[PDB]
């Protein structure tokens, strides 16, 4: 939520998206369509999996310890044992809480950053043939086919072929 992409200038999500996490949706002169982008989804999935499998691997193995349940009242030694146990439990619960609280924030912020990165890349591709309409979509001022949007999707859009037509369409 630091970049303002998810829950920011993109109003809602797409519940019909089942291929990946991030994707496109175009409205053309031949109809409508929809697709996904594998790279951003893969980056997010790899980062989240790395984090998850980072935290959950084990570190402790204890065999013999002290007594923690007593049937009598004795004195100093029992008091010290109970104090030690209470201190250990209270000091580990705080770590358990803080780790989750920090990692959830970092996960949310990185999954928000990936969307902004994809948006900025798509903006940088359409050099001066498109205008940002403010709600997550680009208005492309020249006429594409279903093969023009796919060149924008797999990163080989050639902007200089449609430059003169777009400039005469948008500025006059």
């Amino acid at each position: 939520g630091l970049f303002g992409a998810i829950a920011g200038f993109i109003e809602n999500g797409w519940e019909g998206m089942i291929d990946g996490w991030y994707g496109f949706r175009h409205q053309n002169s031949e109809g409508t369509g929809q697709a996904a982008d594998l790279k951003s989804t893969q980056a997010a999935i790899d980062q989240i999996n790395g984090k998850l499998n980072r935290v959950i691997e084990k570190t402790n193995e204890k065999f013999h310890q002290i007594e923690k349940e007593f049937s009598e009242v004795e004195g100093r030694i029992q008091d010290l044992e109970k104090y030690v146990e209470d201190t250990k439990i209270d000091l580990w619960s705080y770590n358990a809480e803080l780790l989750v609280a920090l990692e959830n924030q970092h996960t949310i912020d990185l999954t928000d950053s990936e969307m902004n990165k994809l948006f900025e890349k798509t903006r940088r591709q359409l050099r001066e043939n498109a205008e940002e309409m403010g709600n997550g979509c680009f208005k492309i001022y020249h006429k594409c086919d279903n093969a023009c949007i796919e060149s924008i999707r797999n990163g080989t859009y050639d902007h200089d072929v449609y430059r003169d037509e777009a400039l005469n369409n948008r500025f006059q």
Binding site: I6, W14, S29, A44, L52, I56, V100, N104, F138
Partner: protein, 318 residues
């Protein structure tokens, strides 16, 4: 139309999950996972650990040789399970520093007993009692020797025993506290007893305390239990002039992974690496909220079972 449009967006789910963050306390994401495991199966699997079921016997009674624990001779355990229905049916006894001996024998993992030939000249061996019947007649513990006067005298017993092996030896002995001042002189002609057990670096001297006690199984006398550890190259000397419960040998002392646990759960033939007093619990999660007493590769005990970690983006539905 001579233009086009290209919109970008992300996915959402109808029901998401509420998680806590640094800023918010309840934020809805598309997916979350739990790290605390708070369920148990109810049974204790006997693989791949070696579990020993102490049905009606404790560890100390199986050590001393109670007549109803004679099936536990040379038991080798990886985890001893102690039940609450356990009781004693022999001579009433007492152990100073009971927890120390219980934890010393529990973590050793063996009840292997090597018998040794002690020479007690001038006394009568193999004393018995009517509170510890082994069969149809009187009996006693199977690892101890109750010596009394031989005819009309009780000489000063002084035995040696050297340790020439390459392991430690554990000796268990005791002292007899009589009930009256008449039964003292009828078993040991001396009016006061004393037991000294010494190595080259330590010594223990105990003196019997004549007095009356509550009746337990028909007796008001008592026995106090002590132990000694002899290291390789050392020597053991026993000196006494009455009130001696002599040993018959030594237990072999080992070091490894072994412990003891009080639990009333049955034992099945499943496979699990963690054991709690409630039964075996899986160990796929890093945390657990079942019991703080655990054996094996167990997750850590936390106070909170609601710990949800987010594994997805934020959930913004239509």
């Amino acid at each position: 139309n001579s233009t086009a449009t290209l919109c970008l967006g992300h996915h959402a789910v109808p029901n998401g999950t509420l998680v806590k963050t640094i800023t918010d306390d309840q934020i809805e994401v598309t997916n979350a996972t739990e790290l605390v495991q708070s369920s148990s199966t109810g049974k204790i699997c006997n693989n791949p650990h070696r579990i020993l079921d102490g049905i009606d016997c404790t560890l100390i009674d199986a050590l001393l040789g109670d007549p109803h624990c004679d099936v536990f001779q040379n038991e080798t355990w990886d985890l001893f399970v102690e039940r609450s229905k356990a009781f004693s049916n022999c001579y009433p006894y007492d152990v100073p520093d009971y927890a120390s001996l219980r934890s010393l024998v529990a973590s050793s993992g063996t009840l292997e007993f090597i018998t040794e030939g002690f020479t007690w000249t001038g006394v009568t061996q193999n004393g018995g009692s009517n509170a510890c019947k082994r069969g149809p007649g009187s009996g006693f513990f199977s690892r101890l020797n109750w010596l009394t006067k031989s005819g009309s005298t009780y000489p000063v017993l002084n035995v040696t025993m050297p340790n020439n092996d390459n392991f430690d030896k554990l000796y268990i002995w005791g002292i007899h506290h009589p009930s009256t001042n008449q039964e003292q002189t009828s078993l040991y002609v001396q009016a006061s007893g004393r037991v000294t057990v010494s190595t080259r670096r330590s010594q223990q001297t105990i003196i019997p305390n004549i007095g009356s006690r509550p009746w337990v199984r028909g007796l008001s006398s008592r026995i106090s239990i002590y132990w000694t550890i002899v290291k390789p190259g050392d020597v053991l000397v026993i000196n006494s002039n009455g009130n001696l419960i002599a040993p018959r040998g030594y237990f072999k002392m080992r070091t490894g992974k072994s412990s003891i646990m009080r639990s009333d759960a049955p034992i099945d033939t499943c496979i699990s690496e963690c054991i709690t007093p409630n039964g075996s619990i899986p160990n796929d999660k890093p945390f657990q909220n079942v019991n703080k007493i655990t054996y094996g590769a167990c997750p850590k005990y936390v106070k909170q079972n609601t710990l949800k970690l987010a594994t997805g983006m934020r959930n913004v539905p239509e």
